[PDB]
Amino acid sequence: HHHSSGLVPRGSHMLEMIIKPRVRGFICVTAHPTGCEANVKKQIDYVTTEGPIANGPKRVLVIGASTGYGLAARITAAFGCGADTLGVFFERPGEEGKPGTSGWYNSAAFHKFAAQKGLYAKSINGDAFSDEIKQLTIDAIKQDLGQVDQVIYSLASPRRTHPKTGEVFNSALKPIGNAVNLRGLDTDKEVIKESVLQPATQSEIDSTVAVMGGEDWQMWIDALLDAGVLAEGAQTTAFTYLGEKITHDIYWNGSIGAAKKDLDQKVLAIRESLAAHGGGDARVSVLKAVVSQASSAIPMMPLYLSLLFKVMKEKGTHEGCIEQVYSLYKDSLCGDSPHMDQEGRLRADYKELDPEVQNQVQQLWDQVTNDNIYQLTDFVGYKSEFLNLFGFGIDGVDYDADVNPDVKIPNLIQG
Amino acid sequence: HHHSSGLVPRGSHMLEMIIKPRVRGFICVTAHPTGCEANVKKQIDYVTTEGPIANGPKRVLVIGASTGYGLAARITAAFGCGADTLGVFFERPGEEGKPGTSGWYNSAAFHKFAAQKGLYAKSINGDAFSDEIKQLTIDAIKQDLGQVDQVIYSLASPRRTHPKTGEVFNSALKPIGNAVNLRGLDTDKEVIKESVLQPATQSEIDSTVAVMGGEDWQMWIDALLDAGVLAEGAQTTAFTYLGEKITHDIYWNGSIGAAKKDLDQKVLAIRESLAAHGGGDARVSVLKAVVSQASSAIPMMPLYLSLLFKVMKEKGTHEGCIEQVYSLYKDSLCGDSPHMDQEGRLRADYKELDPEVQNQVQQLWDQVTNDNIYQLTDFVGYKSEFLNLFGFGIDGVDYDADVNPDVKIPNLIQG
Numbered sequence A, B: 001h002h003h004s005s006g007l008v009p010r011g012s013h014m015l016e017m018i019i020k021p022r023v024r025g026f027i028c029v030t031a032h033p034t035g036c037e038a039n040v041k042k043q044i045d046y047v048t049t050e051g052p053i054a055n056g057p058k059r060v061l062v063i064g065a066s067t068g069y070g071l072a073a074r075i076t077a078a079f080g081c082g083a084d085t086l087g088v089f090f091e092r093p094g095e096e097g098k099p100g101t102s103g104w105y106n107s108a109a110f111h112k113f114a115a116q117k118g119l120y121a122k123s124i125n126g127d128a129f130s131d132e133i134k135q136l137t138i139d140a141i142k143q144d145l146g147q148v149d150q151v152i153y154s155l156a157s158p159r160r161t162h163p164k165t166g167e168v169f170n171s172a173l174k175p176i177g178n179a180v181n182l183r184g185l186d187t188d189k190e191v192i193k194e195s196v197l198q199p200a201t202q203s204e205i206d207s208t209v210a211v212m213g214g215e216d217w218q219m220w221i222d223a224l225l226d227a228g229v230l231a232e233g234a235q236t237t238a239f240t241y242l243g244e245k246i247t248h249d250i251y252w253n254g255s256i257g258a259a260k261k262d263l264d265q266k267v268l269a270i271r272e273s274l275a276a277h278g279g280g281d282a283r284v285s286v287l288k289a290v291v292s293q294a295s296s297a298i299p300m301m302p303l304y305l306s307l308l309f310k311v312m313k314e315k316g317t318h319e320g321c322i323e324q325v326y327s328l329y330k331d332s333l334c335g336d337s338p339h340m341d342q343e344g345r346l347r348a349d350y351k352e353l354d355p356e357v358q359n360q361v362q363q364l365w366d367q368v369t370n371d372n373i374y375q376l377t378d379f380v381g382y383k384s385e386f387l388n389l390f391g392f393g394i395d396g397v398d399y400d401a402d403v404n405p406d407v408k409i410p411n412l413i414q415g
């Protein structure tokens, strides 16, 4: 109520908003619909430019399909191999005044671009750990695809409700046995922060294994096999990180490492199931460390990535999820000469474990306490890539323009 | 609900927003709290820099006190004369997600700055045309000030509900008798638009006089006098515009002109009342054309102002509300040698009626049809000053930062 109220239409701005990055620590509380879309398009265009991958899968299930590596796998299979893709993930839909999560807008863009190219895209939203979500997936496959011939397992989560019992598990990102003296980077005030990380409890370890270990992976493959929706000679892979010595205390030989090690045991039994069903296979694939919501939470990773980026960038070998995964498919999942390590894993992360890269990063580490961080590291690149995840800092996007946060996805089963 | 929901505080951004100009025609649907505040501070600092005005009023009522000339008068009297000021106006308070009008944030800033300097500031929000609002004002004066010694009348409104009957009147901004061939400026697409403005009806004229004529002014002075709240030897003034020939068909000799002419008749009777009460006085004051919500609606004014600005700017005589009003007070309301025209009005607008300024503007007028508008006019300056009204384009304000639109005003009577 003012002297001139109602004399004029309010317009669409009443339903739309200006979305700017709002970052705390390694969590960003907003996501930009238009920027997320441009992101997906960027990855699709990368794949389309590299060109088709021969001997690829045709009907693919991606578990964890909305962001990071799982998204890159979905895009590689669909736009690199022409595959049908059923995506599973867990994201918050946008509504008026309330932007959804990145994975939601990424996936909306996926369905949009896939339809444009005449590709099958359907998605299931909910708790991949649950029996309920497993059954919905099986149902979609039965109805639409008959069977899938590749299953990509790509979940990153802080917790898991056990499907059969009700117990919930929280993962811990902590060292093991010996407490670690942690260097690192306060990304807020942008200063070097020295910290002491206590090791983890036995239970803290058994939980982290429960969440990020390979039990659910095996549950998925088992579920698919007796509903009869896994094609003979199918292929499944689950993603992991090994890193080299500098990350070893916190990651490989830490709580999370313990879980990733469980992956290595479970894969043997899973591989057994598949070889019996028409000579399929199962592998753990190792990928390079990248900026993601998941990895950016790991103690040491922001500074490690900041240094890794600096060094790989000058060698000319820096890359992200889509490059990593396109080459995993081209060279390893579908190639004639696959890169197989001693434990029988597939490898895409070698450019990172390059001794020249690692030695450089290591002597830069202790040397860090700079508060002249911008000289020795690519902390700028890190920040830039972190914002990118949520659709910010993309060229060609007008961030000052109103955008509607209410974006819907067709063929999206809400579980 | 997402895999990481609720694990983190949302923070103040949930209650705050990013406010950007959203303009249609001559109406802007948003206002920036921080920018409006900076605006008020700018006008206060202007007055404080020019320095105190001698022989000023001490207790002042401003009717129409939140924006434009009325605001400039409130600031001049308070910060130029140390006066107590009671403001009356009609504005929309801000709330979460819904920015209030400019006048609201202007007035909040006024009360803030006035308290800082130990000055009396109280305000009344509602329909100045109503008997109800008149009575609340009288009440505040009785309680707080005893009497006021100056009354500034400064309303600009498209409509008026008659206090005694119930009739509502809409004003028309149209020519008279002979229809006008209107040149002009489409401010949206930024091109010269030629138009034909039909003249106005008799009733359209009588209504416009009802709204912008001087009946309410006289009602106010009369109301103040018999409640006994007008000091002996008081002074009242009402603002008007005359312009020169080029604006004459649309303004002076048009519908709005008719109303402003009514002012000239009513002032005689009002002056009579005041001279009897201890030798007070009443004048119509004439001010220069400025960008305001009110004036920016008048056909021809955006292009006229755009040209006026260009020309006055190069003569070095361009100025706005506070400059105009500070000098009205200094030279005319409080000075020894007041500028009085033939009809006995006070004059501040002479720099505008400068024959050199008018001749220049006139031959630039017909010459306009440029669609090279940026060369002949200061259309840029116009836009800039229009955005300024709503708190946009101010230096030192971070428009990318979240701001809380919920700003409250102490000692604000809501009528």
Ligand SMILES: NC(=O)C1=CN([C@@H]2O[C@H](COP(=O)(O)OP(=O)(O)OC[C@H]3O[C@@H](n4cnc5c(N)ncnc54)[C@H](O)[C@@H]3O)[C@@H](O)[C@H]2O)C=CC1
Pocket: A063, A064, A065, A066, A067, A068, A069, A070, A088, A089, A090, A091, A103, A126, A127, A128, A129, A153, A154, A155, A156, A157, A239, A240, A241, A286, A287, A288, A289, A290, A291, A292, A293, A294, A295, B003
């Ligand atoms: N980010 C990195 O440096 C690297 C990560 N990895 C691995 O790759 C895999 C994917 O990780 P990122 O790409 O970083 O993660 P991310 O945070 O970008 O993606 C996780 C995905 O899983 C989905 N998801 C999470 N919880 C879910 C749930 N409860 N139910 C259904 N879906 C859920 C998310 O919605 C998202 O689609 C992980 O196994 C991670 O360990 C391996 C190499 C390095």
Ligand SMILES: NC(=O)C1=CN([C@@H]2O[C@H](COP(=O)(O)OP(=O)(O)OC[C@H]3O[C@@H](n4cnc5c(N)ncnc54)[C@H](O)[C@@H]3O)[C@@H](O)[C@H]2O)C=CC1
Pocket: A003, B063, B064, B065, B066, B067, B068, B069, B070, B088, B089, B090, B091, B103, B126, B127, B128, B129, B153, B154, B155, B156, B157, B239, B240, B241, B286, B287, B288, B289, B290, B291, B292, B293, B294, B295
């Ligand atoms: N803007 C211009 O070029 C010039 C305007 N004038 C005059 O100066 C006076 C003020 O005009 P502006 O500064 O342009 O207007 P404005 O639009 O900036 O201000 C109008 C003021 O009156 C208040 N108001 C409007 N309707 C009200 C209502 N129903 N009840 C209580 N308050 C109400 C508004 O809230 C605001 O405080 C007017 O008489 C106008 O004719 C004179 C010279 C030129």
Ligand code: NA
Pocket: A064, A065, A066, A067, A068, A069, A070, A071, A154, A155, A156
């Ligand atoms: Na993923």
Ligand code: NA
Pocket: B064, B065, B066, B067, B068, B069, B070, B071, B154, B155, B156
């Ligand atoms: Na005013």
